[PDB]
Symmetry: none
Amino acid sequence: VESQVFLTEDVSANDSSCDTTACKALREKIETRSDVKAVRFLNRQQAYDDAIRKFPQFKDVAGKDSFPASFIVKLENPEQHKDFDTAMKGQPGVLDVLN
Amino acid sequence: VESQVFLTEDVSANDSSCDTTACKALREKIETRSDVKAVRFLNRQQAYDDAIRKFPQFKDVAGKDSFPASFIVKLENPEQHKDFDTAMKGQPGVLDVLN
Ligand SMILES: [Br-]
Ligand SMILES: [Br-]
Ligand SMILES: [Br-]
Ligand SMILES: [Br-]
Ligand SMILES: [K+]
Ligand SMILES: [K+]
Ligand SMILES: [K+]
Ligand SMILES: [K+]
């Protein structure tokens, strides 16, 4: 069980490796959480590819631009994710958190 | 661990509880196999919800007809599931098997 923190459109479209300073700074910000053990970046292309695989019926219909880049986040205890989700939603540069 | 047997549309569109002739007949063919311990039914509304829960990106284009219903099947010997998979794939009413 891992959390997924969605990023904003311009980072999604233009940063394929989280090498913009803001995306890196945002990865660091998340890593500082007392309840976070690991943070992994997943770009727009890869996330689209992973989804299309798992559900091969939108191969044409759905485009990658519907898929935000994100951080896949391993928490200390995934049953206590409430505080984390709250912080993320209050964090600038974070679009949403997967519910 | 559990096996997932996806159903063709003729059952997926009609039946919310496996209460149509086609669904039950298919359910009975699976349950009576010696290599099957238990069979659970998963309607298309539950399939839509599980999928959108994991990929809300698809909510743009996915209708209730985009996700097939399924049987969640508990095998007697899970490690040895290769002949079961093939049997199901050759069964009328079966769309696909997970993996
Ligand atoms: Br990308
Ligand atoms: Br239904
Ligand atoms: Br059931
Ligand atoms: Br038959
Ligand atoms: K980097
Ligand atoms: K930490
Ligand atoms: K935010
Ligand atoms: K049986």
